[PDB]
């Protein structure tokens, strides 16, 4: 049970999909905006495609990424809604998500900015490596990229 | 090119396997002991079994763990070789590993201590969550555990 935001986009051997669902509760406490003060839990579902250049087998979750989002109401007066997702696990597996408060029903544009593990902006840079030798190594990390979709929200 | 250390062990809906290979090169530099100054690249392969209680589908890599290792030469009289693995990716996928200097050919005992994402000892604790709500939540993280195996090293 989830609500898709547009259709998934394929880049650098990965599938990037955007979805939302009801606000959630998460451990550790204090990271997510409280469910009672949110409208949705927005998610980025990122999985490896066949022949992924960073060594992930097809269908694997791509871990240690850092995702920033920008949600803008189309024809709205208000400014965009921005934030950072957090890596986490739910009953459907690991993902990147965040509890968001929107600006009522209507048309929205959503932009995700996806940072690789080595990006300056990624706080997980010192904790994740990549083999670089010819025998066991992989291609360099993909470069930071943005993906966008349109969606209509009505209250869930 | 991976050499097995004993047989994999199953615990809390996860398969825990130990392997080693020749030392590797890794980005970012300064984390791994240099390939020339090492004997092996030790690894912990941890994947979800069926009906994993933390929401991982079968075969998925279990991310954001922290592994400490203790390698003892059987009848060696030398002090145990200790260290922390690091999460990383190679051509066969993500894993936990480290470049290690051994104490020559012979029989060794290897002990891994596996810390869940919420362990005090785990440095990635503030970067990974777990849904706890009725609709999308998963069971609490497993408790820190250790696993041991014997292996005979002769060089590679
Ligand atoms: Cu989530
Ligand atoms: Cu490695
Ligand atoms: Mg989901
Ligand atoms: Mg391996």
Structure's resolution in angstroms: 1.7
Strands (E) located in chain A: 3-11, 14-21, 26-27, 40-48, 66-73, 81-84, 86-90, 93-100, 106-115, 128-131, 145-153
Q: Does the beta-carbon distance from A89 to B138 stay under 8 Å?
A: yes
Ligand closest to A92 (CA) is: 3
Experimentally, the structure was elucidated by: X-ray
Residue A29: closest C-alpha in chain B: B129
Q: Are the beta carbons of B100 and B83 closer than 8 angstroms?
A: yes
Minimal Cα–Cα distance from A76 to chain B, Å?
32
Best A31, A53, A89, A91 member to test B by mutation, with max B CBs in 10 Å, is: A89
Best A60, A65, A128, A142 member to test B by mutation, with max B CBs in 10 Å, is: A128
C-alpha pair distances (Å), B64 with each of A68, A88, B90, B154: 20, 10, 16, 32
A88 contacts in chain B (CB < 8 Å): 128-131
Strands (E) located in B12-118: 14-21, 26-27, 40-48, 66-73, 81-84, 86-90, 93-100, 106-115
Helix (H, G, I), strand (E, B) or coil at A66: strand
| Continuous segment of H or E residues that includes residue A105 | none
Token pair, residue B20, equals 């080693």
Q: Are the beta carbons of A23 and A35 closer than 8 angstroms?
A: yes
Q: Does the beta-carbon distance from A131 to B90 stay under 8 Å?
A: yes
Q: Does the beta-carbon distance from B28 to A129 stay under 8 Å?
A: yes
A93 phi, psi to nearest 5 deg: 110, -175
B53 phi, psi to nearest 5 deg: -80, -5
Work out whether the CA dihedral B47, A55, B67, B53 comes out positive or negative. Answer: negative
Q: Does the beta-carbon distance from A89 to B136 stay under 8 Å?
A: no
Q: Which sequence spans correspond to the domains of chain B?
A: 1-156
Q: Does the beta-carbon distance from A133 to B24 stay under 8 Å?
A: yes
Helix (H, G, I), strand (E, B) or coil at A125: helix
Q: Does the beta-carbon distance from A27 to B133 stay under 8 Å?
A: no
A53 contacts in chain B (CB < 8 Å): none
Cβ-based neighbours of B132, under 8 Å, separated by 6 or more: A25, A26, A27
């Amino acid at each position: 049970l989830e609500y898709p935001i547009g259709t998934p986009q394929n880049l650098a051997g990965m599938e990037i999909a955007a979805v939302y669902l009801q606000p959630i509760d998460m451990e550790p406490e204090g990271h997510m905006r409280k469910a009672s003060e949110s409208d949705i839990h927005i998610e980025a579902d990122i999985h490896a495609l066949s022949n992924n250049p960073n060594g992930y087998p097809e269908g694997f979750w791509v871990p240690f990424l850092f995702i920033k989002y920008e949600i803008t109401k189309v024809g709205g007066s208000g400014a965009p809604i921005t934030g950072d997702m957090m890596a986490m696990v739910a009953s459907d597996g690991p993902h990147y998500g965040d509890n968001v408060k929107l600006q009522g029903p209507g048309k929205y544009k959503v932009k995700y900015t996806i940072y690789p593990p080595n990006a300056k902006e990624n706080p997980m840079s010192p904790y994740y490596g990549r083999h670089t030798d010819r025998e066991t190594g992989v291609r360099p990390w993909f470069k930071t990229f943005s993906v966008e979709w349109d969606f209509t929200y009505a209250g869930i």
